[PDB]
Design an enzyme around this catalytic site. Structure first.
Site, PDB file in Angstrom:
ATOM      1  N   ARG A   1      22.914  43.104  52.015  1.00 27.02           N
ATOM      2  CA  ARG A   1      23.048  43.792  53.312  1.00 27.02           C
ATOM      3  C   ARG A   1      23.998  43.124  54.335  1.00 27.02           C
ATOM      4  O   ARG A   1      24.452  43.748  55.312  1.00 27.02           O
ATOM      5  CB  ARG A   1      21.661  43.993  53.939  1.00 27.02           C
ATOM      6  CG  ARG A   1      20.991  42.745  54.506  1.00 27.02           C
ATOM      7  CD  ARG A   1      19.592  42.994  55.073  1.00 27.02           C
ATOM      8  NE  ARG A   1      18.511  43.073  54.071  1.00 27.02           N
ATOM      9  CZ  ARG A   1      18.083  42.053  53.330  1.00 27.02           C
ATOM     10  NH1 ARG A   1      18.644  40.854  53.465  1.00 27.02           N
ATOM     11  NH2 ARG A   1      17.080  42.211  52.461  1.00 27.02           N
TER      12      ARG A   1
ATOM     13  N   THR B   1      24.615  23.464  61.366  1.00 32.21           N
ATOM     14  CA  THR B   1      24.842  22.164  60.752  1.00 32.21           C
ATOM     15  C   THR B   1      25.428  22.235  59.328  1.00 32.21           C
ATOM     16  O   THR B   1      24.892  21.613  58.402  1.00 32.21           O
ATOM     17  CB  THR B   1      23.496  21.446  60.679  1.00 32.21           C
ATOM     18  OG1 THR B   1      22.541  22.269  59.987  1.00 32.21           O
ATOM     19  CG2 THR B   1      22.929  21.258  62.062  1.00 32.21           C
TER      20      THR B   1
ATOM     21  N   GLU C   1      13.498  30.774  53.849  1.00 36.47           N
ATOM     22  CA  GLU C   1      14.388  31.374  52.865  1.00 36.47           C
ATOM     23  C   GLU C   1      14.871  32.746  53.308  1.00 36.47           C
ATOM     24  O   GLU C   1      16.017  33.115  53.038  1.00 36.47           O
ATOM     25  CB  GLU C   1      13.700  31.514  51.537  1.00 36.47           C
ATOM     26  CG  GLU C   1      14.584  32.047  50.399  1.00 36.47           C
ATOM     27  CD  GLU C   1      14.660  33.568  50.266  1.00 36.47           C
ATOM     28  OE1 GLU C   1      14.015  34.321  51.068  1.00 36.47           O
ATOM     29  OE2 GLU C   1      15.411  34.030  49.367  1.00 36.47           O
TER      30      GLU C   1
ATOM     31  N   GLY D   1      21.765  34.317  46.765  1.00 31.15           N
ATOM     32  CA  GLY D   1      20.723  34.994  47.519  1.00 31.15           C
ATOM     33  C   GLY D   1      19.292  34.637  47.210  1.00 31.15           C
ATOM     34  O   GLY D   1      18.393  35.382  47.525  1.00 31.15           O
TER      35      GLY D   1
ATOM     36  N   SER E   1      50.852  33.543  32.881  1.00 30.48           N
ATOM     37  CA  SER E   1      50.262  33.216  31.593  1.00 30.48           C
ATOM     38  C   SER E   1      48.809  32.746  31.732  1.00 30.48           C
ATOM     39  O   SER E   1      48.485  31.904  32.593  1.00 30.48           O
ATOM     40  CB  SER E   1      51.059  32.100  30.934  1.00 30.48           C
ATOM     41  OG  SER E   1      50.496  31.775  29.679  1.00 30.48           O
TER      42      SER E   1
ATOM     43  N   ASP F   1      22.821  11.990  29.749  1.00 29.27           N
ATOM     44  CA  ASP F   1      23.622  11.946  30.954  1.00 29.27           C
ATOM     45  C   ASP F   1      24.778  12.878  30.678  1.00 29.27           C
ATOM     46  O   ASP F   1      25.109  13.674  31.532  1.00 29.27           O
ATOM     47  CB  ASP F   1      24.123  10.543  31.290  1.00 29.27           C
ATOM     48  CG  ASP F   1      23.076   9.687  31.930  1.00 29.27           C
ATOM     49  OD1 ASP F   1      21.954  10.194  32.227  1.00 29.27           O
ATOM     50  OD2 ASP F   1      23.273   8.469  32.183  1.00 29.27           O
TER      51      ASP F   1
ATOM     52  N   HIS G   1      31.300  25.781  42.325  1.00 27.42           N
ATOM     53  CA  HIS G   1      31.297  26.053  40.894  1.00 27.42           C
ATOM     54  C   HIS G   1      32.398  26.995  40.478  1.00 27.42           C
ATOM     55  O   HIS G   1      32.357  28.175  40.785  1.00 27.42           O
ATOM     56  CB  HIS G   1      29.971  26.717  40.499  1.00 27.42           C
ATOM     57  CG  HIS G   1      29.592  26.571  39.055  1.00 27.42           C
ATOM     58  ND1 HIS G   1      28.426  25.938  38.657  1.00 27.42           N
ATOM     59  CD2 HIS G   1      30.176  27.022  37.925  1.00 27.42           C
ATOM     60  CE1 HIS G   1      28.329  25.983  37.339  1.00 27.42           C
ATOM     61  NE2 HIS G   1      29.370  26.648  36.871  1.00 27.42           N
TER      62      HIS G   1
ATOM     63  N   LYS H   1      30.136  40.694  45.957  1.00 22.60           N
ATOM     64  CA  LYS H   1      29.069  39.678  45.757  1.00 22.60           C
ATOM     65  C   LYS H   1      27.856  40.176  44.905  1.00 22.60           C
ATOM     66  O   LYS H   1      27.401  41.328  45.078  1.00 22.60           O
ATOM     67  CB  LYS H   1      28.564  39.137  47.094  1.00 22.60           C
ATOM     68  CG  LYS H   1      29.358  37.980  47.668  1.00 22.60           C
ATOM     69  CD  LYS H   1      28.470  37.106  48.572  1.00 22.60           C
ATOM     70  CE  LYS H   1      29.209  35.843  49.062  1.00 22.60           C
ATOM     71  NZ  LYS H   1      30.708  35.990  49.195  1.00 22.60           N
ATOM     72  N   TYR H   2      27.283  39.261  44.088  1.00 24.58           N
ATOM     73  CA  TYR H   2      26.654  39.576  42.749  1.00 24.58           C
ATOM     74  C   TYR H   2      26.809  41.048  42.345  1.00 24.58           C
ATOM     75  O   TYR H   2      25.996  41.908  42.703  1.00 24.58           O
ATOM     76  CB  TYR H   2      25.210  39.012  42.489  1.00 24.58           C
ATOM     77  CG  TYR H   2      24.108  39.148  43.553  1.00 24.58           C
ATOM     78  CD1 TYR H   2      22.790  38.791  43.249  1.00 24.58           C
ATOM     79  CD2 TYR H   2      24.377  39.597  44.861  1.00 24.58           C
ATOM     80  CE1 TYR H   2      21.757  38.907  44.219  1.00 24.58           C
ATOM     81  CE2 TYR H   2      23.368  39.699  45.834  1.00 24.58           C
ATOM     82  CZ  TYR H   2      22.060  39.362  45.518  1.00 24.58           C
ATOM     83  OH  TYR H   2      21.084  39.475  46.509  1.00 24.58           O
TER      84      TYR H   2
HETATM   85 CA   LIG Z   1      22.719  21.915  57.570  1.00 26.03          CA
HETATM   86 ZN   LIG Z   2      11.845  35.866  48.231  1.00 25.23          ZN
HETATM   87 ZN   LIG Z   3      12.702  38.383  50.730  1.00 22.16          ZN
END
Ligand SMILES: [Ca+2]
Ligand SMILES: [Zn+2]
Ligand SMILES: [Zn+2]
Ligand SMILES: *[C@@H]1O[C@H](CO)[C@@H](O[C@@H]2O[C@H](CO)[C@@H](O[C@@H]3O[C@H](CO)[C@@H](O)[C@H](O)[C@@H]3O)[C@H](O)[C@H]2NC(C)=O)[C@H](O)[C@H]1NC(C)=O
Ligand SMILES: *[C@@H]1O[C@H](CO)[C@@H](O[C@@H]2O[C@H](CO)[C@@H](O[C@@H]3O[C@H](CO)[C@@H](O)[C@H](O)[C@@H]3O)[C@H](O)[C@H]2NC(C)=O)[C@H](O)[C@H]1NC(C)=O
Ligand SMILES: *[C@@H]1O[C@H](CO)[C@@H](O[C@@H]2O[C@H](CO)[C@@H](O)[C@H](O)[C@H]2NC(C)=O)[C@H](O)[C@H]1NC(C)=O
Ligand SMILES: *[C@@H]1O[C@H](CO)[C@@H](O[C@@H]2O[C@H](CO)[C@@H](O)[C@H](O)[C@H]2NC(C)=O)[C@H](O)[C@H]1NC(C)=O
Ligand SMILES: *[C@@H]1O[C@H](CO)[C@@H](O[C@@H]2O[C@H](CO)[C@@H](O)[C@H](O)[C@H]2NC(C)=O)[C@H](O)[C@H]1NC(C)=O
Ligand SMILES: *[C@@H]1O[C@H](CO)[C@@H](O[C@@H]2O[C@H](CO)[C@@H](O)[C@H](O)[C@H]2NC(C)=O)[C@H](O)[C@H]1NC(C)=O
Ligand SMILES: *[C@@H]1O[C@H](CO)[C@@H](O)[C@H](O)[C@H]1NC(C)=O
Ligand SMILES: *[C@@H]1O[C@H](CO)[C@@H](O)[C@H](O)[C@H]1NC(C)=O
Ligand SMILES: *[C@@H]1O[C@H](CO)[C@@H](O)[C@H](O)[C@H]1NC(C)=O
Ligand SMILES: *[C@@H]1O[C@H](CO)[C@@H](O)[C@H](O)[C@H]1NC(C)=O
Ligand SMILES: [Ca+2]
Ligand SMILES: [Cl-]
Ligand SMILES: [Cl-]
Ligand SMILES: [Zn+2]
Ligand SMILES: [Zn+2]
Lengths: 677, 677
Positions: free
Chosen positions: A154, A213, A360, A454, A557, A593, A616, A626-627
């Site tokens: 959104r 921040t 979140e 997300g 190329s 490792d 990445h 986006k996705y």
């Molecule tokens: Ca921060």
């Molecule tokens: Zn959730």
């Molecule tokens: Zn949610």
């Protein structure tokens, strides 16, 4: 052992926890979400974890004014308010005395009161804006979309409205997208009522975390940017509404007709794109507010400086019956079950961290700030991150998104698990999953998708390069997403009454964590990365080959990238031969490792262009789609809509540069798997 | 063991190698420097190394036109060329048939032919430009400096000339700085003749490496920027001259007099700052040219995925008798001596890499490009980098610059070494060194300086955060630096006829590498970092306290940084207690990884402001005063000349932000040394 761990997981415990977490709202920044963290913290101690701490941060949140409410309005020539959109959603049966249900709102919208005329932009996609702008010469400088939720995140919709001159955004949930044919609205089925509204933030953070921040934890002495210089804040006001209120707004709509049947929903309305045949009232404040993550530690016995993380958010918009408490209740039982083994004197080989992230729903802030504070530990010691948000968004089959490094762990793990599906009693989870959801990319195997963005895995995977996955039960979003109707009752009655899907998800997440934390050789197979790197290279080559002339003129190329991919394939081959033939802790550590740092090898420290926190080179959201976009996002984005660019040699130069960057990075990743000396 | 390794090092071998490396020029990009790499590669194989490869890169170099030479000229009213500066330096005795001595030039100067009037800017420092600009209201838009070499890196001088409007730069070596009283010019002493000229590049790369490929190795498929978008290229022309030619240019100088005795040299001239009482002719091209690094490998027996690097450059301006072949001849003997032990069946515990870097004189390009290609290996596996440029720039005492993590290794190592000094026969190297060069910062201990910039350790320390050091013999630059007079004869006759200083340096570098590659616990003492972090915090606090009013108004607190430093001190304490009390390879590895990753912890992945390739928050050149400025360079630079800034609250905001960044980083580094779980 593993069977022990799994047999201790019980559905009734999950039910019990879900009910416990869903009786009041647990909105980020409120005292109620603080008390829930304190409770999780006690319980995780009781369950047996070596330590359980609060990690707090002071972050930019957003709330509606409790006394000057937000709403949209229809207005006549003389400035009177005919239609008023709802102030609240009708609470579900038995929750009428819910204290502190926050009303529908778009978190992080600026305050405003813009007047102007509607314009229906469909899903407000890039594609859809190329429809209005490119074909039908519609132009919105000064106009207000209206758009339906769906398809894209959104925040991209508001970003797209911004770029295109718009001065307000109205967001509504259309029944075409959120009303499953043949099932009744809540409370008598799992469908969205006309009074239901999808909350959600509309930030475009591109992985930055706390908007004040970027790069650094929002701790007690942090220097905060001014709101003016903040990352990802919208400039135009935005508000969501249910479909009853959207009916009123959309029925009197005129101007040009819809271009096709893909631009029309299922409300009894013309779906007229406008312009003309509206005033918004917003009012929400932003404010620095303390959030609390809960971090549990189960110290490993042999490799305590190697971390496996099981993490999911605790904050909800309202009751969070599915999102996220169906995840968190699974995490709670997993923890209980690990602590049970611990109490019988067992320990995992590697350290397991358990997290209950905060804020979140406000842009992945708890996870992100915690990762920013501990990035140094995570990047040298981080084996894997398993997310644990919503366990169910449906009851048809398993959905797994993960790094290719975890394909075999997941295949193997599900062959040892009992399917919970109707008509698959006795059969394995691998069996149901691959019958119900086969791989398009060949052959007799289940589909596993790309990790995008997300949720809280984002900072771990996309910024830090820690191998990540997630698993949940899915449909063939879900209608009640982020509305007040998302309750415990919604889950017990309509989604998972046995809690057998919940328990299956707990076994997949818990068993992944178990395997990762205990297996002697890390359960990663680098040959799987080789296979998909080829697919992704072919894919991106094809998109470029739609411009054959320009490839000849500018000498574009892909040889270097295919060469890198072939080398990856050969080296990963030789590397798995060695992994099988060897005895000796130091050689074991070294090889682990190498396995651990491999995902890390795909991180470019400069990031992607204008997105420093997406580092990445293979996965990582495209700046546009986006996705929904492709892998090798740097090349994909350099190519997207490239025929429209003013200076083609400069635009094709940048495609070449991104080929170089991708080829170099794949070759460099490969070489981490070569013999070390 | 160690004594074995050291006793095998011989001065005669070093002499023999130095003579061997200094008979022809070994300029970066030329066939001669290619052949020297091939030779090093054979010899390193013969000496016993497990592998020795060439790593090549195609980088931007710079050369004078062999047929349209560069020179400066004095011109009259009618445009005639009265004075011409020399085209070459007079070759030293016995080298008259030297093929391919490149003439004096400023590498990377653009071509031009600007006419205009002299202006003497002293050393062309920031300080010196604050003299002309701030006090004496002198203004150079359109004028040509003239400046003496010295004090600061020569690229800062051209940067400063650029910023201040200048249209050419002339660089000369004044006898005040490069003519030691009482000693004769070469060939009869070690002083600079009037015909001698200091070559050197004038790039401002700020760690970027190859100007065309910042971030990525300049390999066969690299995408190169256009010269227009290149990093660190000057825009005005520049040329160096000896003091005979500078006499001619400076004698007819008028305008304002020198402000004091610190602005006047020792040529029999007024040192008149100008303006007025000159035409330049340049002509140099830039061109992508292949360079060759030589990488030798001595595989470790127990920890082959842990790298100790002994590295130094091979390229020279002309014969490189001191710079760098006095370093490289030491590296050659060290390698021989390690390979000798290897041949008797011994191996080091960790892997040692040996490097002969190319194109160092052109802006650290060999080392940098190699580090950019292998950054992933280096950052997870890199224990330490010991540089190995010039072994001697004098014959008085030892100079050591290193990370605080290596203070005790260096103290301990030199107590076991015999001083080579006159009047210290029988006494230790620790003894002579600390008598001759005591610590100002207390107490009965030798001075060890900060690592700054401008040699090949730069990318390892300042970008990648790998613990680094260097050691060489020094004076109480050196006069013949980067002139044709820098020969083997200069060293054998005047600097080190026994080669006993060379051998001492070989033992310090070789023994450091030995200790680092073999000791069971890494020989780092993190408490030493704690001590200097305090000093550096006090220092930076003092510079801020020159503005007490502004600290009150904007609430500039250093509490967070002192708090971080105290925590570092406590945790490093507890950590060394644990390092002593423990048995078990895995616990050993873990504690060593903590020791190894500690320097790494001081790297900020965002870099410093506008210098993305300087990522170390503690050390790392200041943007203004380069090696000459302070630690915590981000805070220091935010404060530098802060009284002159237009918007004080914005400027003081940025001081606070840098306090935050530094405090956070010190705290985060500390926490890597906390218990891991
Ligand atoms: Ca921060
Ligand atoms: Zn959730
Ligand atoms: Zn949610
Ligand atoms: C994948 O791995 C192969 C190694 O198996 C890499 O092949 C290398 O390719 C380059 C040309 O692209 C070769 O460069 C050449 O070097 C010689 C001197 O050695 C020089 O005279 C030539 O002008 C040329 O520049 C390189 O040596 C070659 N190595 C081989 C075949 O052993 C390939 O680059 C790898 N792919 C990627 C994207 O890294
Ligand atoms: C150096 O280490 C100490 C720990 O020994 C850190 O002390 C911490 O300082 C902050 C205040 O600056 C404390 O925050 C407080 O948290 C409580 C809840 O725990 C809250 O109610 C208060 O309003 C306040 O925000 C923190 O808990 C405290 N921890 C202690 C004393 O154990 C210090 O921050 C470290 N220095 C740096 C720069 O990290
Ligand atoms: C969720 O479960 C927990 C504990 O199983 C309940 O918390 C406890 O409640 C009892 C009765 O008030 C007290 O003795 C303890 O103080 C509580 N322990 C805590 C907070 O850790 C909690 O009330 C349950 N929540 C709901 C809404 O049922
Ligand atoms: C998943 O299971 C497969 C099949 O059991 C594992 O592959 C085998 O691993 C064993 C044990 O090291 C080898 O000896 C066999 O040769 C392998 N067989 C095949 C077909 O490759 C695989 O290792 C497992 N993957 C995990 C646990 O990551
Ligand atoms: C520096 O020393 C090396 C070897 O000790 C000399 O190189 C060898 O020279 C002899 C005579 O030409 C040949 O047999 C070999 O082909 C050479 N080996 C190589 C290049 O590895 C080299 O000539 C010496 N350089 C000078 C100028 O004295
Ligand atoms: C340098 O030498 C000093 C003195 O020998 C070493 O410090 C001692 O280390 C031993 C061995 O682990 C300890 O048992 C002693 O208690 C230490 N003494 C002191 C005064 O600290 C020091 O470890 C050496 N530093 C190195 C090699 O990095
Ligand atoms: C909408 O709200 C405003 C503010 O309270 C009011 O003046 C207006 O008449 C309302 N419309 C209706 C239908 O109540
Ligand atoms: C749960 O299972 C049944 C079985 O098909 C299905 O009809 C129903 O739609 C499912 N519930 C949800 C919410 O998808
Ligand atoms: C300086 O060089 C130019 C170009 O060769 C020449 O015309 C001029 O006269 C020269 N001056 C002297 C003193 O030779
Ligand atoms: C070498 O040693 C002697 C001893 O003091 C000194 O006089 C001379 O200056 C030294 N040589 C150099 C180049 O510094
Ligand atoms: Ca480069
Ligand atoms: Cl999830
Ligand atoms: Cl050096
Ligand atoms: Zn040098
Ligand atoms: Zn030099």
């Amino acid at each position: 052992n593993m069977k022990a761990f799994l047999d201790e997981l019980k559905a009734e415990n999950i039910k019990k926890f879900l009910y416990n977490f869903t009786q009041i709202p647990h909105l980020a920044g409120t005292e109620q979400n603080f008390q829930l963290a304190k409770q999780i913290q006690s319980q995780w101690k009781e369950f047996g974890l070596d330590s359980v701490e609060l990690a707090h941060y002071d972050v930019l949140l957003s709330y509606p004014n409790k006394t000057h409410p937000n709403y949209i309005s229809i207005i006549n020539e003389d400035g009177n308010e005919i239609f008023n959109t709802s102030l609240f959603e009708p609470p579900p049966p038995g929750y009428e005395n819910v204290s502190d249900i926050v009303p529908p709102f778009s978190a992080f919208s600026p305050q405003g009161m813009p007047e102007g005329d509607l314009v229906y932009v469909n899903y407000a996609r890039t594609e859809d804006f190329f429809k209005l702008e490119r074909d039908m010469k519609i132009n919105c400088s000064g106009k207000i979309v209206i758009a339906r939720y769906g398809k894209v995140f959104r925040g991209n919709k508001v970003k797209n409205a911004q770029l295109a001159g718009a001065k307000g955004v109205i967001l509504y949930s259309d029944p075409a997208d959120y009303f499953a044919p043949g099932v009744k609205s809540y409370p008598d089925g799992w469908n969205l009522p006309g009074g239901g509204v999808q909350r959600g933030n509309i930030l475009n953070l591109n992985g930055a975390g706390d908007p004040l921040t970027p790069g650094y934890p929002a701790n007690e002495y942090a220097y905060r940017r001014g709101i003016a210089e903040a990352v990802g804040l919208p400039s135009i006001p935005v508000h969501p509404i249910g479909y009853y209120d959207a009916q009123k707004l959309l029925e009197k709509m005129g101007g040009s007709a819809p271009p096709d049947s893909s631009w029309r929903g299922s409300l009894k309305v013309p779906y007229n794109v406008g312009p003309g045949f509206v005033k918004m009232h917003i009012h929400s404040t932003n404010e620095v507010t303390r959030i609390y993550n809960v971090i549990g530690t189960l110290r490993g016995a042999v490799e305590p400086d190697r971390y496996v993380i099981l993490g999911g958010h605790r904050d909800s918009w309202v009751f969070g019956g599915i999102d996220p408490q169906s995840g968190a209740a699974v995490v709670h039982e997993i923890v209980r079950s690990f602590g049970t083994l611990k109490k019988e004197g067992w320990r995992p080989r590697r350290t397991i961290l358990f997290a209950s992230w905060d804020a979140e729903e406000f842009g992945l802030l708890g996870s992100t700030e915690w990762a920013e504070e501990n990035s140094r530990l995570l990047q040298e010691r981080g084996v894997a991150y398993i997310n644990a948000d919503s366990s169910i968004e449906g009851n048809y089959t398993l959905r797994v998104d993960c790094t290719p490094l975890m394909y075999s762990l997941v295949h193997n793990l599900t062959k040892e698990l009992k399917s919970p599906d109707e008509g698959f009693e006795g059969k394995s989870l691998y069996e149901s999953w691959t019958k119900k959801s086969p791989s398009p990319e060949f052959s007799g195997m289940p589909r596993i998708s790309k990790l995008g963005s997300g949720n809280d895995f984002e900072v771990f995977f996309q910024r830090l390069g820690i191998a990540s996955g997630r698993a949940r039960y899915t449909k063939n979003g879900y209608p009640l997403y982020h509305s007040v109707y998302e309750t415990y009752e919604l889950v017990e009655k309509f989604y998972d009454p046995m809690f057998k899907y919940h328990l299956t998800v707990a076994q997949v997440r818990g068993g992944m964590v178990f395997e990762l934390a205990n297996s002697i050789v890390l359960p990663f197979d680098c040959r799987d990365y080789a296979v998909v790197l080829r697919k992704y290279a072919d894919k991106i080559y094809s998109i470029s080959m739609k411009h054959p002339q320009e490839m000849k003129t500018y000498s574009v190329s892909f040889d270097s990238l295919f060469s890198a991919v072939k080398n990856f394939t050969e080296i990963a081959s030789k590397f798995s031969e060695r992994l099988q033939d060897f005895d000796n802790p130091i050689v074991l550590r070294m090889m682990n490792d190498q396995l651990m740092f491999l995902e890390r090898a795909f991180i470019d420290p400069l990031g992607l262009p204008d997105r420093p926190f997406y580092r990445h080179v293979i996965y990582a959201p495209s700046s546009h789609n986006k996705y929904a976009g492709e892998s090798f996002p740097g090349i994909y984005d350099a190519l997207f809509d490239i025929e429209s660019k003013v200076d083609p040699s400069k635009a094709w130069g940048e495609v070449k540069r991104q080929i170089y960057v991708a080829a170099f990075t794949v070759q460099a990743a490969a070489e981490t798997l070569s013999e070390v000396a």
